[PDB]
Structure formats: structure tokens, C-alpha cells
Amino acid sequence: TYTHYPLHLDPSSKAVSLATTGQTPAQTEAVEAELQQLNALHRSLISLDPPNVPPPPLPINPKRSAQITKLKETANTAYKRGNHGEAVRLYSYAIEMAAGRPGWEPVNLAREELSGLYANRAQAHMAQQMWPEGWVDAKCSVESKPVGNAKGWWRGGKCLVEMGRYDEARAWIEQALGIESDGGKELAALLEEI
């Protein structure tokens, strides 16, 4: 049935470590990566609670979202002052804080939060004349949540048209208008700027 892989646990570490042998470097590196991911899973489970099982994903802890929205609010209020360095720094910090959280929690919450944070950081980059980083952040945002979002497509198209490469901008605006009302008017105005 199962293939016996000779393992060996280490005291005081609680991270299993495969003792040498599956007679092939490919299998060795595969089981090493899987073993590291299992160690990470064990660390997350022991950090969860005094018990070990993960709670169901229907209820949501509000402290994470509260801290995230407070950080986003203070970052936006600092950006409204005019400076952008500390603004983009706080944006990236909030991005890291949101993305570092466990994965058994509902995916839609983290998806929407990353969408908003990527959109805000893309706008902050657009305020700094930095076109490539703003465009890649807008691309990340639009890939996070495509529907119900238009500022992302608009900022991506603006970054493109400002930096050149009119073919990719045409394809971008084409897909945006295909998916899609201020968004429609903005897309039409940006397409007419060709």
C-alpha cells in the first residue's frame, strides 16, 4: 500500500526530518519541501490554540480586519497630506500583515483586502511617477478581484498609455470594457485617448 519513508523526529524541535536513503535526488528534494511545509503547518497549528484542531471557517475573528482597516485608514490619511514615501511604506506593511495570516480562513476576505490594498498602493505609485511598479500593483489588484472593480483597470490603462506599449493598453481596455456607470465612462474616455 504505502511506501515506508524512513523518518526521524528531533526532540525540542517538533519538526520531522527525513533521514537519508528515495534513492533519487528528485524524490529527496520533493519530500524535503513537503517536510518543510508540514513543519510550517505544525507551527501554525500549535500557534492556533491550546487545542490543535482548526475551527470551522464560518465565524471570522474581527481583530485582524479591525487592525487592517485601521492601518489602511491611517495610511490613507497620511497620504492625503501630500507625502508618498511613508504612505507606500504603510501600504506595503498592511499588505504584508494581511497576506501573512493563515489560509484556512475564508479566501474572499483576504482576497478583497488585498484588492483594496493593491489598488491604493498602485494609486500611491502613480502619484510618484513610478510607472512599472504602479502597473504591476494594478495588475495584481485586478487579478485579485476582477468583477465590481474599475479603478484597477483604469490605473493599469493609464500606466500603460503613459509608459508606451499601445498594444497592451488596447488589449487591457478591451478586456475591461468586455467585463465592465462611472467605470464605463472612464474606460471609454481612456480608450478615446489612443
Partner 1 sequence: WLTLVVPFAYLGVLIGCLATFSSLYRRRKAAKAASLEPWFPPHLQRDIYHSLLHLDQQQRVPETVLKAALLRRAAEDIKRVMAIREQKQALALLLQRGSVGDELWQRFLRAEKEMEDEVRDVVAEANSYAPNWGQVIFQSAREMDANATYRARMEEYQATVAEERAWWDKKR
Partner 2 sequence: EYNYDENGQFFPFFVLTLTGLVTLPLTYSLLAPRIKSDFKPQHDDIIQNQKRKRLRKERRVKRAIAVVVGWAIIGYMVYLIIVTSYSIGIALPKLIIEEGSGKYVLMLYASLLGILLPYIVGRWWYGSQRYTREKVLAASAGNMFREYEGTMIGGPIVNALSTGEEYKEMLSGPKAEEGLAKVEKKVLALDEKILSAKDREVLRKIDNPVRRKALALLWAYLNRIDLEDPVLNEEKYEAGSIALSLTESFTAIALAFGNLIPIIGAYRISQCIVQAISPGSSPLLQLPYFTPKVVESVEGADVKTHLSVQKYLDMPEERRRSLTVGPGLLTEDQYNSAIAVAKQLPLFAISKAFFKVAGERVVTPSSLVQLVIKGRIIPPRVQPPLAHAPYLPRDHPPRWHIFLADAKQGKIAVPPFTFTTFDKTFNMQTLRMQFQAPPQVGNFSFVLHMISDSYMGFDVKQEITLQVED
53 binds partner 2 (CB under 8 A): no
For 191, phi and psi rounded to 5 degrees?
-70, -35
Contact partner, 178, from partner 1, partner 2, none, Cβ < 5-8 Å per class: partner 2
Ramachandran region of residue 55, left (φ > 0), alpha (ψ -120 to 50) or beta? beta
| DSSP-assigned letters across all residues of 15-51 | --EEPP---SHHHHHHHHHHHHHHHHHHHHHHHH-SS
**Is residue 150 within 8 Å of residue 185, measured between CB atoms?**
no
For the window 25-64, what string marks contact with partner 1 as x by the rule CB under 8 A?
-----xx--xx-xx--xx-xxx-----xxxxxx-------
111 binds partner 1 (CB under 8 A): yes
Nearest to partner 1 of 144, 149 (CB atom):
144
Nearest to partner 1 of 171, 189 (CB atom):
171
Rounded CA-CA distance 83/163 in Å is: 23
Residues that bind partner 1 (CB under 8 A): 1-9, 14, 16, 30-31, 34-35, 37-38, 41-42, 44-46, 52-57, 99, 103-107, 110-111, 114, 131-133, 135-136, 139-140, 143-144, 163-164
